[model samples]
Target chain A: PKTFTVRIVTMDAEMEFNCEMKWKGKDLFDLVCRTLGLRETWFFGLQYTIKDTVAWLKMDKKVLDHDVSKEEPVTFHFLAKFYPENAEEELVQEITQHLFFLQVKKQILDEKIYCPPEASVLLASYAVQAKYGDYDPSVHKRGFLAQEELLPKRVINLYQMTPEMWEERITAWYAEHRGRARDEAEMEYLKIAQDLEMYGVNYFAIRNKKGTELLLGVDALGLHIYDPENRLTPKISFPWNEIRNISYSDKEFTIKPLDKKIDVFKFNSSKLRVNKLILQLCIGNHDLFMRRRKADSLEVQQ
Target chain B: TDMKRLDMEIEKEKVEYMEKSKHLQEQLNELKTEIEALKLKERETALDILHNESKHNTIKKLTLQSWKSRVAFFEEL
Candidate 1:
């Protein structure tokens, strides 16, 4: 039978898998997990591009159904789909933690997840330690950061300081991490990003009923509404438990809360397809939230 | 008398068409001027937000409370 050879790009490795046309999305996910020697399978999923946006693969659907495309060289990114509230306690394996660290770092570097100014510099310091253990002033000169571009451009532009001012601060912090192991430094980087305002959040631009454009961020704990004016803080936060129902009809998405006083929060997404993706993420996150409650060892309750 | 009347009617039609064409050319030029003015207005839009610089020339200092946890992370030998 003719098969599609697809590539899965993990945090540390890139590997290819040949898939039968009829293979479900979970088939590839299962293969990637087992190949990586990972037991904590529920925390991760494959990401593929569709309509120029990254989305989590639907496990139940056939691979062909997901628009795998007749176009050449299909690629899937192996990433942490579910983030636990407590990374240190909840994520069991070092490899799993390492993968989470890499994913978060990518998000920060890409500015997919916003890092505040001071913390951003600290994170960059750990990045330096991770790359070159025990920063040597001779080797890791001021010009190193000019090439690295570790912090996002927005921070660089907004902070209004000379490159030396920023680099000196980062290097001073880098000197502090003298004896930390590479992996430890990587973890420390994530730990710093964790405390920042926008860590671990997946944000989407949507509008409220009043047509006020706001940021809707989804993560392990719940949904957050951030005002465009102050991205550092969320205007409203909703834990999964508080949300009674989530649904969308075309472009309009709604989140109904458990209480009667506040009826519902509704927003209109820019695209109908994006609305669908947001609902899917919400459902998946809510299910993960349930699974963490107790070790109830059943096949699962869908 | 009939030939003179025919020539008069044809000349009147030609003058009317020339007047209409001149009026249309004026309208087209007015539209071009409007577009140029609109473009100039566009150049003056909410672009300052992006170009605006921070008042603090130095790096914005974090409080000791905020700086403590980061220090403690390294202090533990």
Candidate 2:
């Protein structure tokens, strides 16, 4: 029954989700629904604690994500959770379509589950598996984001609005509002893509022998390469073969695609070194989500 | 006869001392050569330290740039 910080990101901007948290004194879903003026989305008086996992998930049809596949998506739940207040406030609002929900739900159920130190590593691992067939068995394919140079002086900044801080907050908000499952997966994907680009690896820029390059986009597999002249399209495929074994002078590999138009991008890396760093950070995040899901579910059972 | 014998002994002592001096000089030259070689080793070790320092600097530079971009990307949102 302590307060935790939550950040919410939407397609356009990032925002801090300020909710005063407390222990298991009252039903969380009921409180939320009443505050927002929606009918009970659950029959069991959905509490957001560990004990409410079964009812919370069953009412939301999210039980499989934690129990069966550990891959079930929380996108709907995350968005719902994040936007509940907003949605309640609006007379007309956007709701996730039945089809989008179904597509991601199966993908979550069918996809494998993995843990790592960083969320990005989980994303990278998934990208590699989706694109290259499997993660490298010989190497430990995990890593971490930069550790908080100084551990956070403040845990949750409800009114915090730094851009980087805001972005993270939004992303976390998306996950939480989406529920634990889908947000964790999306975060994993995001962390890997960004981490790869930072480390300069798992992606490539294709240049002609004459030194002319092409492309400007990203894909589902996290390849951010694109061809501009032919209408500026981003090629989003599963395998990132276009950027295979590409190296940079600085020794870091290219995990992000190169944009020739940008001069600073010339120094982009292709180093495989950053992979380990991303993996550790991503896994650490997923583990926390898993614990939250478990605790919430247990609360529901009781 | 006394004078001739005296001169001969003096000549002999001078020859013996000159040979000992030359040998000692050669030993001194060898010690100087050893010191020069040690100086060269020290120079190489210093260069190695410098080389590693450069690598670390490069790593820091790249890391900073990457972090800046990341911060900007998030900030822009």
Candidate 3:
């Protein structure tokens, strides 16, 4: 059996591995996945350059079937192919989601996906928000969206104009469509942000009493801990009214529910910091929730 | 000596053809990847349009009896 030494170039470094010539290309892929600690490998495939352009190595075919050489090590590029129809559910990994987000953005920019005038404007607004943050005419006035290639020409033109001009354009359109259902636009922004690398930088992680690791993310709606590692566990959620008496110490983090027995978490100082940050953020979120609830109730009474 | 030269020339042509074939295959692969991305985009757009139509009922609408009467009228015509 002949063994070929292949060097795979990853984002960080080059990984070298030996593969039997008789083994299928998938065997090499399995080695790569095991080395990289990547569990979700379905959307990714291995591609090697041929004549200066990249081509996928057939997974089911043997290495010897291809024009592979022992002298030249095969370097593979892990490319993402996200087919919405083929996907059973939405991708959860932050990195994978980010790649999918860019693909969708590219399609939009290319005009492959049709959008109405209002929807297009809203789409540009959200893209700008993702790159430059919430529209600040004072700060964002002069600069274009960070990456010129990713942006549509329409958005590029809109951005090149003064931020004041852009803001007026957005505001005017928003006013005209006021009180109309804009769930699609809201969903569009949510889709982009949810996949961002730093989407929930404020998130806190901990293990449950049952020893299952949990990731806690906070938003305006309420506090929720969803399955971030794998979609194994159903998400747990609670309103501010249902949760009470959250206390933290040097090594202990406690949560007292209105009805259920209190739960206590023990962690080292660094992990405890994650817990502390969660507590602080939860307090802020609770305050916002309360204000919104009060305003809602008052409106109802009126 | 002439036969030896002819063999070397054949070897050179083989290597050149191999390189050309690889380059063409690379272009074909690139186009396939782009086509795959386009297919995904088409599916996504179709889904979005389907959802939008279902949510807003933007398509032509008619009540059950109205639709039956229209069919009946068409049959009489």
Candidate 4:
């Protein structure tokens, strides 16, 4: 059988799968869904790195057409591709929730998602609760979090305190959650995560209509024009309420604002396929955003 | 009298053309707007399917598989 091995990597664990040459992207996805019993598959996607940039696999396309086909033991990073407004309510599955926890941890570690140092410690504590469950004095000691990848290294690096100091602070918060379940702990991790500035925001490199390079970020809130040098803040914001339409042609992406007097915000994507993923993510985020506002009218009656 | 008639004719033509321009502009905008609406509609349809699929597969990996493996992972210095 003409086949290759596929390694699916999530936040904390990795698994390898056997695949044949005749498989498609959907084939791989369905296999994983069945294996994990993932009922909510739309919020996640298999990502692979290409030329130092990450791209989501086109699940409808064949595996032969993807970067995953180019190498042996191909690694597809399973990630939470879209974020719902509320994690605890929106992400319903235990497996899906755990994967999201993994993804959020990766985002925070890489600093893609921003949080304050203090809040990062809080998130770390919840992570500790999720992993180790309740805090018991006999087994849990001062250095329980010493080897944990809980906090962002860059932030931790700047703290000027030993790892033990950070460990003490995180454990103090962890002790407060004496009897919470691991699942609840994980949910609360994302619950507090949703309030952060850059939570769930995916950034893309593109230039504005005037040719100034900027990053366009799409999150549950809306599209944001982020300053590349300082991605922590968005220079211009367009909440989902204000974005009238999103359309793209070639490499040019256009966003219509709710105000008729405002000029259409348009930009040129550095890559052609970039806009395709942007639009897909944009649609997914917009759908979730609008549905949340209406609160289960189901669009069935509307 | 000739100059007055000429000015009136120009004014009349201007109004008609401007009205026509506005109608065609609406036609263009209407099509573009419809395209945008259709995308959102497609997304809504997708969400419908996803919610149903979420209802399916209720049957419920390396995936934190072993207790030792989990312990080994966190202990990695």
- Which regions of candidate 2 deviate over 4 angstroms? A1-210, A231-302, B1-77
Clashes of each: 0, 73, 0, 0
How would you encode candidate 1's per-residue C-alpha lDDT over A1-302 as one tens digit per residue? 76888888998888888877888777778888888988777778888877857777788888778765545457888988767666766667778878988788888878776554555676888888888899887888767777676776655665445788778877877897899998888876765567555666677888766676778878767776666665555545666766678888868877776765555667778775566568777887777775666554212111
lDDT of 1: 0.68
The candidate with the higher TM-score, 1 or 4, is 4
Model 1 misses residue A202 by how many Å?
A: 2.1
Colliding residue pairs in candidate 4: none
DockQ per candidate: 0.01, 0.01, 0.01, 0.01
lDDT of 3 by residue, A1-302 (tens): 67877878654457788878788878887788767666555545566654433445556778667544446576676544222211213354555444445545555667544332234455556544455444444554443443344334443342234445445444433333333333333334444333322232234555544455556545433444445552212144444555555667765555455555433222222354244345545565555456555653111000
Misplaced by over 4 Å in model 1 are: A135-149, A157-167, A209-212, A259-262, A293-302, B1-77
**Candidate 1: docking tier:** incorrect
Q: Which tens-of-lDDT digit does each residue in B1-77 have in candidate 4? A: 99999999999999996895576345434533433322333333322233222101110112212323322322231
Off by over 4 Å in 3: A1-23, A31-37, A47-56, A67-77, A86-89, A110-121, A131-141, A144-147, A153-302, B1-77
Between the candidate structures 1 and 3, which one is better when assessed by lDDT? 1
lDDT of 4 by residue, A1-302 (tens): 78888899877678989977788777887787777788788777788877656778776677778864567788898777778777867777899888888778778778777555566777888889988989998999767666778788655554455678778877877897879899888887887677666677788988755677778888777776666765555655666766678898888877776667665667778675566678878877777678778785211100
lDDT of 2 by residue, A76-183 (tens): 122222111111112131223221222222222232111111222123233333223322324422221123221121211212234344234223323222223443
